C-alpha cells in the first residue's frame, strides 16, 4: 500500500496517482503515517457516496478514523464542534451559526465585501510598486478573507490588522510549534473576552447571536461559543488566501482566460466555479470511519475501517468533467456539481461566502490594475510544499 498523502506532481498539479487509480483501481488502500491502512476513493460517484452515506461516521474519537499526521491525532482529543459531529448533533450545532452564511444573508453582505476589497486594492495602489514588486499575498490575499471573517464574528476594526497577522502565524510554515500555539491561545483568549462583552452588550455579529440565542437560554456553554467562533475563524481562512493567489497565478498561466475576464468582468462567477474545481485547495477533509460493513464498488469496507474521499480526484474525473485537466472558465458544466467545498450535510458552511468573496475579487482586481502581472517567472512561483494542499506562499507582483 502506497503511503498517503501523495505528493503533488508539481507546484500547481494534483498527485499523479489519482489519474491512475481512477482508471485501474478506484477504491484502494493506502498506508498512513502510523502504519495503519485506509481506503481511498477517487471517483466522483464514490466520493459523493462517502459524503452522504449514513453508515459512515465523522467522529474523530472512533478507532479507525484516518488521521494523516501525529499532530492530527493530538487534535482529536479536544472537545468536538459540529465539524466532527454526526447527526443529529451535527445539524443541531451547525444551525446555530448557519443563518449568516445562507445565500440571501451573503447577498446582503455584498456591498460590504465589495467595500473591503476596494479599500485593500486602494491601499495596495498607494503602497506603490516603484521600488520593486509587491507580495500579493500579504498585501491583499491575506487581509481580504481575514478582515471579513473577523468583522462577521464581531472584531473591532482597529484590531483587524494585528489579529490577521496572528492567525497567519498558526499556518505559517516558518513558524515554530512554540509560535503557532502561542498564536492559538492569543486568539482563543481574545475571543473569550469578546464573548464576555457581547453577553453584556450584544451587537450585530455572529458572537452576539450565539450569546443571545444559545448561551443566555442555556443551550450551550460560554466556552462552546468560543470554540464555535474559533472554528469559524481558522477553518477556511488559509484556504481562501490560497484560492485568491491561485486564481491570479492561473490567469497569468492562461493569457486567453485573462483577456476574457478583463473584457467582461461579469465572467467572474464562471471563473470562480472553474477555479474551485481545478484547484481543490482543501483535498484532505473528507474522511470517515465505517460504522458497519459497506460496499463501495468492488471492495467492501469493513466496520471500523477508515476512508478518505479525494474531492480533488473527483474534480478531475474524466467520467464527469470532460477535459478535466484543462482550465476553462467557459466550460460546459454537467448536472453533477464540483466538490471543491464538499458534499452532503458537512458541505462547507461558507461555500456561498467564499464564492462571493472570490467573485468580488476577480471582477474588481483587473479593473483596478489592468496591467497587473506576476513579477517572477511562472516556473519559479513559490507554491506550498508538494506533500500538502495546493497553495502559494508568496506572490511578487507589479502593476
Ligand atoms: C474557498 C475556500 C474554502 C474551501 C475550498 C473550503 C472547503 C471546505 C471543504 C472541502 C469542506 C467540506 C468537508 C466535508 O464535506 O465534510 C469544508 C468544511 C467546512 N468549512 Fe470550508 N472551505 C472554504 C472556506 C471556508 C470559510 C471561509 C469558512 C469559515 C467561515 C469555512 C468553514 C468550514 C466549516 C466550519 C466546515 C465544516 C462544516 C461541517 O462539517 O458541517 N470554510 N470546507
From Swiss-Prot:
Protein keywords: Acetylation, Heme, Iron, Metal-binding, Monooxygenase, NAD, NADP, Oxidoreductase
Effect of residue 170 to E: Impairs interaction with NADH
Induction comment from the UniProt entry of this chain: By nitrate/nitrite.
Annotated phenotype, changing residue 71 to G: Improves the NADPH-dependent activity
Catalysed reaction equations from the record: nitrous oxide + NADP(+) + H2O = 2 nitric oxide + NADPH + H(+); nitrous oxide + NAD(+) + H2O = 2 nitric oxide + NADH + H(+)
Signal sequence interval, chain numbering: none
Lineage: superkingdom: Eukaryota
Annotated effect of mutating residue 69 to A: Decreases the NADPH-dependent activity
Effect of residue 389 to V/L: Impairs catalytic activity
Gene Ontology MF: a single term: oxidoreductase activity, acting on paired donors, with incorporation or reduction of molecular oxygen
Enzyme Commission number(s) of this protein: 1.7.1.14
Effect annotated for changing residue 282 to V/T: Impairs catalytic activity
Oxidoreductase is among the record's keywords: yes
Acetylation found in the keyword field: yes
Consequence of changing residue 74 to A: Decreases the NADPH-dependent activity
Regulation: Cyanide, CO, and oxygen strongly inhibit catalytic activity.
Region: Disordered, residue numbers: 1-17
InterPro entries: Cyt_P450 (IPR001128), Cyt_P450_B (IPR002397), Cyt_P450_CS (IPR017972), Cyt_P450_sf (IPR036396)
CDD domains per UniProt: CYP105-like
Binding site for heme: 348
Summary of the function given for this chain in its UniProt record: Nitric oxide reductase which is involved in a dissimilatory reduction of nitrite. Acts as a nitric oxide reductase. Is able to reduce nitrate and nitrite to a gaseous form of N(2)O when oxygen supply is limited or discontinued. May function as a detoxification mechanism.
Family listed: Belongs to the cytochrome P450 family.
Protein name per Swiss-Prot or TrEMBL: NADP nitrous oxide-forming nitric oxide reductase
Species this protein is from: Fusarium oxysporum
Source organism phylogeny: Eukaryota, Fungi, Dikarya, Ascomycota, Pezizomycotina
